[PDB]
Automatic annotation (TrEMBL):
Gene3D superfamilies with a match to the protein in the record: Phosphoglycerate mutase-like (3.40.50.1240)
Protein's recorded name: Multiple inositol polyphosphate phosphatase 1
Reaction equation(s) it catalyzes: 1D-myo-inositol 1,2,4,5,6-pentakisphosphate + H2O = 1D-myo-inositol 1,2,5,6-tetrakisphosphate + phosphate; 1D-myo-inositol 1,2,5,6-tetrakisphosphate + H2O = 1D-myo-inositol 1,2,6-trisphosphate + phosphate; 1D-myo-inositol hexakisphosphate + H2O = 1D-myo-inositol 1,2,4,5,6-pentakisphosphate + phosphate; (2R)-2,3-bisphosphoglycerate + H2O = (2R)-2-phosphoglycerate + phosphate
Enzyme class: hydrolase
């Protein structure tokens, strides 16, 4: 499908994908990114507008270029005061995830079931939590609910802000030269810019690539805003594919298991994996009587968490940057409203099984099971504990 690949090429700006309803679990352990949101930064919009205005001043625009400039000035007005907010689409995404959970596992959330939800201090994540919880409560007002949020959860939901080596890597690390070299190889600006600008070949490579990247960025976020305007047809399938490859590599190297990061971006997630294991263990032991723990955070929470779990292919360490896109796909991991759900079951012989859902689809671990997608919890916990120990060892290589 051409249209489906185009949406996937928004990468971690892809809206949550379409999903469908349909033994019973006794506990659900959840992490969810906020839902679809407005752009967080005006920088890409400003860069597009400045290039076009400067071109208009030297007779450099085509007719389509002038139409684009007017659209860009309108988006600047519509985005004002909205930056980074959860959109109406992001609310409905959360209602959809909660609603499907309820219809799939009605017994777990029936009667006076207890649920806890936490979120970061970031409003779009808090609003996502509330869209989710409001759906849950509307379906069953007899739910018992604990809701909290804030900086007190930084250690498990914003670990990427707290590790100094990782912040330095993200801001100044060795992945940047590789990404910039890859953009230069991959982005072919002249055919895009020819749509809007006379003499596109008179632009320096660097400015042409930056213009095109910024335009792609504006077009990629627009479907997340619920504004009835569309730029994605500003670009062909191949053009979107090339852009996506560059942004995919950016996410992989800066946030996941790329060799150049030496697993530092993944290792920092170990406190959340530890906290997942503890909340499950406490529910199993009776220390907790929650039927579910929900957590609302960010793509930089989800991506390293998923890699640290070792969900197959997501922790791949691809040596050759040009090959990353074949083996690791950001839109499969952390689209808008991305979420991970561990579903725990007790079979009739009382053994505990766990099923992992990544964006509501069963995910594989590199351990054996006689009944995929269900894994032994004892086996899975031992595996996760090994991952956590590996993460602590990795972090020991960095002060």
């Amino acid at each position: 499908h051409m249209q489906t690949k185009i949406q996937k090429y928004a990468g971690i700006a892809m809206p949550y994908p379409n999903r469908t309803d349909s033994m019973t679990p006794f506990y659900i352990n959840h992490l969810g990114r906020h839902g679809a949101r407005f752009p967080t930064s005006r920088k890409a919009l400003d860069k597009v507008e400045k290039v076009l205005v400067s071109a208009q001043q030297e007779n450099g625009l085509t007719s389509e270029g002038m139409a684009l400039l007017s659209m860009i000035r309108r988006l600047s007005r519509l985005f004002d005061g909205q930056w980074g907010k959860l959109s109406k689409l992001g609310e409905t995404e959360q209602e959809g995830i909660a609603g499907r959970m309820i219809r799939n596992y009605p017994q777990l959330f029936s009667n006076s079931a207890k649920i806890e939800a936490i979120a970061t201090y970031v409003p779009r994540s808090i609003n996502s939590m509330d869209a989710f919880l409001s759906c849950m409560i509307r379906h069953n007002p007899a739910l018992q609910v604990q809701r909290s949020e804030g900086k007190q959860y930084n250690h498990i939901l914003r670990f990427f802000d707290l590790n100094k080596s990782y912040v330095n890597y993200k801001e100044k690390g060795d992945w940047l030269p590789i990404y910039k070299a890859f953009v230069h190889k991959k982005i072919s600006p002249v055919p895009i810019m020819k749509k809007f600008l006379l003499n596109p070949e008179q632009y320096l490579d660097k400015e042409a690539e930056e213009f095109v990247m910024a335009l792609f960025s504006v077009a990629a976020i627009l479907p997340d805003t619920s504004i009835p305007l569309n730029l994605e047809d500003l670009f062909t399938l191949d053009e979107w594919h090339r852009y996506w490859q560059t942004q995919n590599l950016r996410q992989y190297m800066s946030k996941s298991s790329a060799p150049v990061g030496k697993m530092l971006p993944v290792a920092i997630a170990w406190p959340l994996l530890s906290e997942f294991i503890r909340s499950a263990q406490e529910v199993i032991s009776g220390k907790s009587d929650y039927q579910a723990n929900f957590r609302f955070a960010h793509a930089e929470t989800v991506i390293p968490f998923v890699s640290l779990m070792g969900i197959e292919k997501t922790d791949v360490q691809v040596c050759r940057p040009d090959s990353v896109s074949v083996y690791w796909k950001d839109y499969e991991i952390s689209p808008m409203a991305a979420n991970v759900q561990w579903l725990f079951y007790r079979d009739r012989d009382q053994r505990i099984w766990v099923k992992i859902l990544l964006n509501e689809e069963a995910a594989a671990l590199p351990i054996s099971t006689a009944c995929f997608p269900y894994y032994s919890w004892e086996k899975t916990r031992i595996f996760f504990n090994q991952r956590i120990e590996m993460a602590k060892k990795t972090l020991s290589v960095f002060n």
